[PDB]
Design a protein around this ligand. Structure first.
Ligand SMILES: *[C@@H]1O[C@H](CO)[C@@H](O)[C@H](O)[C@H]1NC(C)=O
Ligand SMILES: *[C@@H]1O[C@H](CO)[C@@H](O)[C@H](O)[C@H]1NC(C)=O
Ligand SMILES: *[C@@H]1O[C@H](CO)[C@@H](O)[C@H](O)[C@H]1NC(C)=O
Ligand SMILES: *[C@@H]1O[C@H](CO)[C@@H](O)[C@H](O)[C@H]1NC(C)=O
Ligand SMILES: *[C@@H]1O[C@H](CO)[C@@H](O)[C@H](O)[C@H]1NC(C)=O
Ligand SMILES: *[C@@H]1O[C@H](CO)[C@@H](O)[C@H](O)[C@H]1NC(C)=O
Ligand SMILES: *[C@@H]1O[C@H](CO)[C@@H](O)[C@H](O)[C@H]1NC(C)=O
Lengths: 596, 201
């Protein structure tokens, strides 16, 4: 009779047909990932094409039910998700051009090989170079050569392609009733229709700036300390008053500072909390790693893994004969099927990764009761944040002593906590200005704030102003320096890392307050606490049915992203960094004082 | 005296193929001896929920007729085979009365009723104008009209086909695995009761 009942029947046929087509696409993708063979590639492509064509036909059929005559929030949310045109609103020629541009950028980034002039007999791919030279070298000109050569080749290839990409994506977004592609990306956090819990696309930029303004003192002190240590490592290149040279940050782009922990360690003489040798001595298999992770999740009250998980997952590298992707990935195949694809080694990193991916699996399992099109995180930040909180809790010395991996007579003094917090800051705090600057630059490019002839002049100006990182030599507009990163070149949103980082510590404070932890936030473990797991599972069960603001109210009691839990987490380190920066100068100058 | 002529529970539980939930099979069991302790003491059944009578005294009581309804549903739909419960199965496929005397027996049949390509031989009615009455079977394949517009025998806009298939896969989760359900309905009528339990010597 009514339009709302008609939409409900349509979304009762859709959920059933789509779950089957999804599970076939996901199965084919799994079979390709665990077995790289040409028939598996063909089967994956066929299943993906069937899935995409089916989504196109249902999107075409879903728009005939008008949104304003539906009052039920869940039905309206599913219909809103389905009624998005995506690229379909664009013309077929332009859609084909956009798809071709995306594929060719993927090939250029994936198969970009650069080596030294006059020695071209063998070259280096993206993965060998990053793992070996950008993370381990201590030579200024070698890192400068690798950085400039990779940005020269990749940027000069990708600059016209990116110029076409911005225009096509803006055309599609304005055809989809958005201001620009940046508004399309910011629409993931948009909440409309709920009284009090409404969130606007324009509020996201203001909230990100407001949080970053509070991030800035901690980052400035960390930048000063890293600058002093890098000045010790490289004597003449780094200036006391200027920005850090770009190629010296330990990674290819400056995304993470975690590779500078060796150079910038506060107390080298004190030991680390590495438990790898202890697992090797006790012969811990990957099965034991996942069973310990499962024990951690049952301790907090969450459900344990299914039989189909232990049976169908690949938790060890298969061998030489059978090839598989080595990247750890949690798969929600649908139809109640949850699997982890990880080539697990006996390392601390793999153990923490097992906790992170099983956290992803727990999040996927929790919203299985929800309808098919609402089976996702409330926003893109929550899905990663719920894995990162498990990574935070598992890495604590209390957890390691509890599970027997660390000696019970290990002395936890202030110095080890300071160096551990510095490592966590280099991984977590260091990525925040880079993430914010990159997303703000992309938003300004999509919005038209930056003309095409001024992309790099603004970009370096942004990087000096925000990240405090200076270019080694000036770049003209023939370069395309942002697109050398994986996420930007392959059409991925980048604000998820910033939101994930803030949500991680907000969730950590909420669960630690629930678990009645009485010490520092970084010393908190959420094992053995049923109430903390219940508080988490209340949000976990909702999925995408409820607004992210309401989910955040469910966990932390706040309606907006907050920066105070992060600052509370790093407060011992913040006081220590303030003490260590008395002689040195906090802050940077945007001038060309170190090198240009 | 010497007891023989046991009831054919082998041809219901151990059947090679089961019917779909919509066209659920009903077998009337009469004029034999029904040993219910053989069913209860089996370890192969995941659900043996009895409503209106207890399993211990089933082996003693005697009934006029026994209705064995057999079908295949999903793991998450076993809960809907109960009095009062409301779901797609209860509303549109198989409805049990509130005043039901009998037992609902369900067991996981992932081994038999799944295949690696997907077994699409089990169907469920997903749409009907009204809810089913208890112990009603609807095998009609008429196009469901969700809108004012007449369907005219095509699955066009707002007009859906009622019967949908369950994609049964071995790697599926327990909730989505096929479960064979046998519902035994016990009624006592004024006619001579002939389905009796075995009597001790
Ligand atoms: C991987 O693919 C090969 C290709 O023929 C196949 O023979 C093999 O059985 C596959 N392995 C698994 C575990 O399915
Ligand atoms: C919205 O629809 C769902 C089923 O799709 C129903 O369970 C829920 O109660 C409805 N909510 C409102 C407010 O009508
Ligand atoms: C999707 O595109 C069609 C074709 O132009 C249009 O009629 C429809 O309104 C669009 N849907 C939305 C939600 O903008
Ligand atoms: C999960 O926990 C339940 C109850 O503790 C137990 O019966 C079941 O065997 C467990 N499953 C696995 C795979 O450990
Ligand atoms: C660690 O604690 C000792 C004793 O309280 C103190 O003397 C020392 O300065 C502290 N160091 C740091 C880095 O807090
Ligand atoms: C959590 O519980 C298990 C078993 O109840 C126990 O062995 C473990 O030590 C507990 N964790 C802590 C930190 O006490
Ligand atoms: C059904 O099959 C099982 C499996 O072997 C068997 O033990 C049982 O006796 C058979 N008959 C009945 C009535 O359950």
């Amino acid at each position: 009779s009514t339009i709302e009942e008609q939409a409900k029947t349509f979304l009762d046929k859709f959920n059933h047909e789509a779950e089957d087509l999804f599970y076939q696409s996901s199965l084919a993708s799994w079979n390709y990932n665990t077995n790289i063979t040409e028939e598996n590639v063909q089967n994956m492509n066929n299943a993906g094409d069937k899935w995409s064509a089916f989504l196109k036909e249902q999107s075409t059929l879903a728009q005939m039910y008008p949104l304003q005559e539906i009052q039920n929030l869940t039905v309206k949310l599913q219909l809103q998700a389905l009624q998005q045109n995506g690229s379909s609103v664009l013309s077929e020629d332009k859609s084909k051009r956009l798809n071709t541009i995306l594929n060719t950028m993927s090939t250029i980034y994936s198969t970009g090989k650069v080596c030294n002039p006059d020695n071209p007999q063998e070259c280096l791919l993206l993965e060998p170079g990053l793992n070996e030279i950008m993370a381990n070298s201590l030579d200024y000109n070698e890192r400068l050569w690798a950085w400039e050569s990779w940005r020269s080749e990749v940027g000069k290839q990708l600059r016209p392609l990116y110029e076409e990409y911005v225009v096509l994506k803006n055309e599609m977004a304005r055809a989809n009733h958005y201001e620009d592609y940046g508004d399309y990306w910011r629409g993931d956090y948009e909440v409309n229709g709920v009284d009090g819990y409404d969130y606007s696309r324009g509020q996201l930029i203001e909230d990100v700036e407001h949080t970053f303004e509070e991030i800035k003192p901690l980052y400035e002190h960390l930048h000063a300390y890293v600058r002093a240590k890098l000045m010790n490592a490289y004597p003449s290149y780094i200036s006391p008053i200027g920005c850090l040279p770009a190629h010296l940050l330990g990674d290819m782009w400056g995304r993470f500072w975690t590779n500078l922990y060796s150079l910038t360690v506060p107390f080298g003489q004190k030991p680390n909390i590495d438990v790898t040798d202890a697992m090797v001595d006790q012969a811990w298999d990957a099965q034991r790693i996942f069973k310990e992770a499962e024990k951690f999740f049952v301790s907090v009250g969450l459900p344990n893994m299914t039989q189909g998980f232990w049976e169908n997952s690949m938790l060890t590298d298969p061998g030489n004969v059978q090839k598989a992707v080595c990247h750890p990935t949690a798969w929600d195949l649908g139809k109640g099927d949850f699997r982890i694809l990880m080539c697990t080694k006996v390392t601390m990193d793999d153990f923490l990764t097992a906790h992170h991916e099983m956290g992803h699996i727990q999040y996927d399992m929790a919203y299985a009761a929800q309808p098919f099109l609402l089976r996702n995180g409330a926003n893109e930040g929550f899905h990663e944040a719920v894995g990162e909180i498990m990574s935070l809790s598992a890495a604590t010395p209390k957890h390691l002593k509890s599970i027997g991996l660390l000696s019970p007579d290990f002395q936890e003094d202030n110095e080890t906590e300071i160096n551990f917090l510095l490592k966590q800051a280099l991984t977590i705090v260091g990525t925040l200005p880079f993430t914010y600057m990159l997303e703000k630059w992309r938003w300004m490019v999509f919005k038209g704030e930056i003309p095409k002839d001024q992309w790099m002049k603004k970009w370096w100006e942004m990087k000096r102003e925000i990240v405090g990182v200076v270019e080694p030599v000036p770049h003209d507009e023939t370069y395309c320096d942002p697109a050398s990163l994986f996420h930007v070149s392959n059409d991925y949103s980048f604000i998820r890392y910033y939101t994930r980082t803030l949500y991680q510590f907000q969730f950590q404070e909420a669960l630690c307050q629930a678990a009645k932890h009485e010490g520092p936030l970084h010393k908190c473990d959420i094992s053995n606490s049923t109430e903390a797991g219940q508080k988490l599972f209340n949000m976990l069960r909702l999925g995408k049915s409820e607004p992210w603001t309401l989910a955040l109210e469910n966990v932390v009691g706040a309606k907006n992203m907050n920066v105070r839990p992060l600052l509370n987490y790093f407060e011992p380190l913040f006081t220590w960094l303030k003490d260590q920066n008395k002689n040195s100068f906090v802050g940077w100058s945007t001038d060309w004082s170190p090198y240009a | 005296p010497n007891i023989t002529n046991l009831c054919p529970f082998g041809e219901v539980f151990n059947a090679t193929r089961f019917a779909s939930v919509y066209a659920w099979n009903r077998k009337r069991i009469s004029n034999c001896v029904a040993d219910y302790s053989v069913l209860y003491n089996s370890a192969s059944f995941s659900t043996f929920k009895c409503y209106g009578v207890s399993p211990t005294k089933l082996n003693d009581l005697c009934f006029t007729n026994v209705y064995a309804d057999s079908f295949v549903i999903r793991g998450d739909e076993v809960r809907q085979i109960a009095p009062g419960q409301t779901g797609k199965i209860a509303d549109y496929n198989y409805k049990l009365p509130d005043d039901f005397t009998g037992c609902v027996i369900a067991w996981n049949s992932n081994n038999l009723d799944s295949k690696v390509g997907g077994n699409y031989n089990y169907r469920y009615r997903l749409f009907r104008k009204s809810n089913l009455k208890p112990f009603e079977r609807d095998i009609s394949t008429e196009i469901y009209q969700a809108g004012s517009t007449p369907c005219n025998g095509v699955e066009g806009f707002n007009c859906y086909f009622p019967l949908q298939s369950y994609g049964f896969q071995p790697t599926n989760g327990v909730g989505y695995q096929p479960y064979r359900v046998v519902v035994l309905s016990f009624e006592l009528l004024h006619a001579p009761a002939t389905v009796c339990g075995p009597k001790k010597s």
